[PDB]
Design a binder for this molecule. Sequence first.
Ligand SMILES: Cc1cc2nc3c(=O)[nH]c(=O)nc-3n(C[C@H](O)[C@H](O)[C@H](O)COP(=O)(O)OP(=O)(O)OC[C@H]3O[C@@H](n4cnc5c(N)ncnc54)[C@H](O)[C@@H]3O)c2cc1C
Ligand SMILES: *[C@@H]1O[C@H](CO)[C@@H](O[C@@H]2O[C@H](CO)[C@@H](O)[C@H](O)[C@H]2NC(C)=O)[C@H](O)[C@H]1NC(C)=O
Ligand SMILES: *[C@@H]1O[C@H](CO)[C@@H](O)[C@H](O)[C@H]1NC(C)=O
Ligand SMILES: *[C@@H]1O[C@H](CO)[C@@H](O)[C@H](O)[C@H]1NC(C)=O
Ligand SMILES: *[C@@H]1O[C@H](CO)[C@@H](O)[C@H](O)[C@H]1NC(C)=O
Ligand SMILES: *[C@@H]1O[C@H](CO)[C@@H](O)[C@H](O)[C@H]1NC(C)=O
Ligand SMILES: *[C@@H]1O[C@H](CO)[C@@H](O)[C@H](O)[C@H]1NC(C)=O
Ligand SMILES: CC1(C)OCc2cc(C=O)ccc2O1
Length: 512
Amino acid sequence: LANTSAHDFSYLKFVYNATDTSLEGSYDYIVIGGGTSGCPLAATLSEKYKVLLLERGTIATEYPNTLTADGFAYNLQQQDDGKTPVERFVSEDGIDNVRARILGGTTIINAGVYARANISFYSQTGIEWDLDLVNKTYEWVEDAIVVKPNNQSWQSVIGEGFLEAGILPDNGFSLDHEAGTRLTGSTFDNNGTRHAADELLNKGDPNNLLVAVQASVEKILFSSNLSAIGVIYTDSDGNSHQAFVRGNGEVIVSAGTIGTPQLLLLSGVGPESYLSSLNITVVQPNPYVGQFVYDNPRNFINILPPNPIEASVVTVLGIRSDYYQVSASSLPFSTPPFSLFPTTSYPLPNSTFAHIVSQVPGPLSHGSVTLNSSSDVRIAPNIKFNYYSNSTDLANCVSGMKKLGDLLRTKALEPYKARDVLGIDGFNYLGVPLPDDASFETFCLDNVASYWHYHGGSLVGKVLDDSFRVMGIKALRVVDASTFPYEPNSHPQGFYLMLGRYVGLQILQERS
Ligand SMILES: Cc1cc2nc3c(=O)[nH]c(=O)nc-3n(C[C@H](O)[C@H](O)[C@H](O)COP(=O)(O)OP(=O)(O)OC[C@H]3O[C@@H](n4cnc5c(N)ncnc54)[C@H](O)[C@@H]3O)c2cc1C
Ligand SMILES: *[C@@H]1O[C@H](CO)[C@@H](O[C@@H]2O[C@H](CO)[C@@H](O)[C@H](O)[C@H]2NC(C)=O)[C@H](O)[C@H]1NC(C)=O
Ligand SMILES: *[C@@H]1O[C@H](CO)[C@@H](O)[C@H](O)[C@H]1NC(C)=O
Ligand SMILES: *[C@@H]1O[C@H](CO)[C@@H](O)[C@H](O)[C@H]1NC(C)=O
Ligand SMILES: *[C@@H]1O[C@H](CO)[C@@H](O)[C@H](O)[C@H]1NC(C)=O
Ligand SMILES: *[C@@H]1O[C@H](CO)[C@@H](O)[C@H](O)[C@H]1NC(C)=O
Ligand SMILES: *[C@@H]1O[C@H](CO)[C@@H](O)[C@H](O)[C@H]1NC(C)=O
Ligand SMILES: CC1(C)OCc2cc(C=O)ccc2O1
């Protein structure tokens, strides 16, 4: 595990403005998106080869509130001016959401929770994983940026509560996704400093790795034996740039669940009928690009204790097969953190509150990503998740919401009631309190938010082979959250950080 230490920006010595035309030319690898998977991938490939990492966002030093636990709410509260580290969007379902626009990607804006994948996930995928390597790669990430969190009074309350509510066994401190109650790792250190995927660039070879920031990759370039050969990207002034791969090199798309399918569709990789209807020339027909896009539901209640509670970052997890629960305690605010609540018309708290949540696993419900613009990558694509279109997800939210009921009934939570009455109506609620089964179904459907753990759109077995290659195209891979249809665990940053380096190692091995 990592120590308490300042955020390591040493890698800025090889970070350049995309306006610099001397970045243009040939590389062994081009990685698109300096995010959760993309940074460790680029750092790994740079051990042996010349790598260009292209990131549309700027550097995290420009937005200091990204570098502390205390800053979490600020980045969501801040207006999206097209330059900010948080990009706001609204799914076609009507649910407010965010994605990262910064070097380090969503690890620079997220809630810091670190877990390893459910050990059953690997065999469920049917990919021939090198499981020893997976574990060495987890340790490489964890050594760099993960800590054992210190005690936080709210998280200890919630852990006592989960155990009293029957979420057993007590797993103590563990990074593993396993049934029961545990303290998990965090990418916020014990001084509250955020550590993130951008610090994994410090593991790259500074003679081999170049990073362009404010680089908007607009198109993947192909050969006239179809190969990816390069990219077109534009800089912050709007001028265009080209970079290419050479010899046995490859372009990897690491632009996230939203950005990867968007760039593939803009490049003519996607469903023939759909692309044809936009007069986009088809380079590689594939009916599944931007299909099987998922967003795990977040359902929640908010309690307002009659005495102040101390704000906390989530470290204590309550895990069952059918639901994953946590709680954060928060200061009040008069500017809402965008997407914490599903719409902007949610009532504001004006005292300290506990946000107590359950996450639907999978989920089984899915939607898609489609282009809004057929040319401009800076225009966000359309995204729809179809929350609770699958009855199994609704069934699982019902079970989760019943367990949050059990949690509000524990001795652990009894001190946070406004009235010493027998029932959970003894709490004061911000928004809709918990309510047979139909009332819980209505509550699940009506009060859903994003968990922010959206995934899919470029699935292994649909768009990619078991080596993350785009089927039908040489020298093109995708490595990020677009790649799997089901969550590897409650909190997937750990899996995607691991995946970046792991796939980089598989690329270096395939080539040796
Ligand atoms: C608010 C929030 C809180 C979360 N909290 C947690 C948590 O506590 N723990 C946890 O495990 N998970 C959490 N998650 C989820 C997790 O952080 C993400 O699922 C994961 O980081 C996604 O990694 P990725 O590489 O797929 O995408 P990203 O990390 O978003 O990386 C993609 C990168 O590509 C860039 N990009 C996009 N398109 C282009 C383009 N055309 N050209 C150039 N660059 C481009 C983006 O700017 C971005 O930097 C959270 C998510 C959010 C939004
Ligand atoms: C870890 O993932 C595994 C496999 O995806 C889950 O085990 C499955 O769970 C369902 C519901 O309990 C069972 O009906 C399946 O048959 C199980 N499959 C296998 C291969 O064991 C497990 O639930 C996940 N664990 C947690 C705690 O989320
Ligand atoms: C890149 O250069 C332009 C000036 O041409 C400037 O406006 C922009 O802020 C720079 N971006 C970064 C990330 O330095
Ligand atoms: C990988 O580490 C996990 C704990 O995260 C352990 O359960 C598992 O047995 C390890 N697998 C191998 C192949 O060593
Ligand atoms: C595609 O181009 C043809 C002209 O070849 C035109 O008839 C049609 O409307 C165009 N469709 C779109 C959506 O641009
Ligand atoms: C683009 O997104 C807007 C939201 O601004 C949506 O309402 C509009 O219909 C979209 N256009 C296309 C072509 O998808
Ligand atoms: C839900 O998902 C399962 C697994 O994909 C699928 O078998 C089924 O068709 C879906 N169920 C409903 C209610 O649509
Ligand atoms: C569980 C979850 C979403 O984690 C993070 C979080 C942060 C805040 C502060 O704005 C408030 C509530 C909250 O809850």
